[PDB]
From a paper:
While we failed to obtain crystals of Mag-2 in the presence of DDM, we successfully achieved crystallisation in the presence of a Mag-2:DPC ratio of 1:3.5 (4 mM Mag-2 and 0.5% DPC = (14 mM)). These crystals diffracted to atomic resolution, revealing a α-helical three-dimensional structure in which two antiparallel monomers associate to form a dimer via a prominent hydrophobic interface. One monomer was observed in the asymmetric unit. The structure of the monomer displayed a single α-helix comprising all residues (Gly1-Asn22) except Ser23, which was not ordered. Notably, the aromatic side chains formed a long-range connected network of five aromatic interactions arranged in a phenylalanine zipper (Phe5/Phe16’, Phe5/Phe12’, Phe12/Phe12’, Phe12/Phe5´, Phe16/Phe5’). The opposite side of the dimer was dominated by hydrophilic residues, including eight lysines (Lys4/Lys4’, Lys10/Lys10’, Lys11/Lys11’ and Lys14/Lys14’), two histidines (His7/His7’) and two glutamates (Glu19/Glu19’) at the C-terminal end of the peptide contributing to an overall charge of + 6. Upon further examination of the crystallographic environment of the dimer, we noticed that a hexameric channel-like structure based on three peptide dimers and threefold symmetry with reasonable peptide-peptide interfaces could be constructed (PISA´s resulting interface of 4596 Å2). The outer overall dimensions of this hexameric channel were 3.5 nm in height and 4.5 nm in width, and a very narrow central pore of approximately 0.35 nm. Within the pore, two layers of adjacent positive charges, mainly Lys10 and His7, were located, while residues 10–22 did not significantly contribute to the inner pore architecture. Specifically, we demonstrated the ability of the Mag-2 channel to allow the pass of chloride anions, being non-permeable to potassium cations.
Magainin-2 (Mag-2) is a well-studied AMP, originally isolated from frog skin, consisting of 23 residues and carrying a net positive charge of + 3 (sequence: GIGKFLHSAKKFGKAFVGEIMNS). It has been shown to effectively kill MDR strains of Escherichia coli, Klebsiella pneumoniae, Pseudomonas aeruginosa or Staphylococcus aureus. Like other AMPs, Mag-2 interacts with negatively charged components such as LPS, LTA, and bacterial cytoplasmic membranes, leading to membrane destabilization. In this paper, we focus on Mag-2 which had previously also been shown to exhibit discrete conductivity steps when embedded in planar lipid membranes.
Author numbering:
A (entry chain A), B (entry chain A), C (entry chain A), D (entry chain A), E (entry chain A), F (entry chain A): 1 to 22
The structure:
Amino acid sequence: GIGKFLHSAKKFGKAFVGEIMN
Amino acid sequence: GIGKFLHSAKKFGKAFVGEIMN
Amino acid sequence: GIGKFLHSAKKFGKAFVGEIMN
Amino acid sequence: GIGKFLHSAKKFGKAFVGEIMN
Amino acid sequence: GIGKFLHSAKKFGKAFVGEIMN
Amino acid sequence: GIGKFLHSAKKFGKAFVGEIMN
């Protein structure tokens, strides 16, 4: 639900920024 | 790293599809 | 904040699915 | 269409960066 | 620019759906 | 597969940051 979406979004977003900078 | 990115992407993607259908 | 994020995510997600199918 | 996709993407992207930094 | 964004989005979106279903 | 996903993600992510800053 909303919790899983918000939590998963933040984790993914941080990992994605890391990939963009690699 | 790559593992965290791939894993987090799949979790987020599934949650996002769930949100779009809600 | 959280409201804008959730709302914008749903709008984007729906538009993105539309683009993928075009 | 393309307009909605581009507009919604920018709004979402800005909100997502905000969430990542929160 | 806009072309690269639109093109890259579609490619990514299709690949992402593929990952979600794997 | 995984290669296409990772490559397409990085390209999209960079283009998306560019759009957010435009």
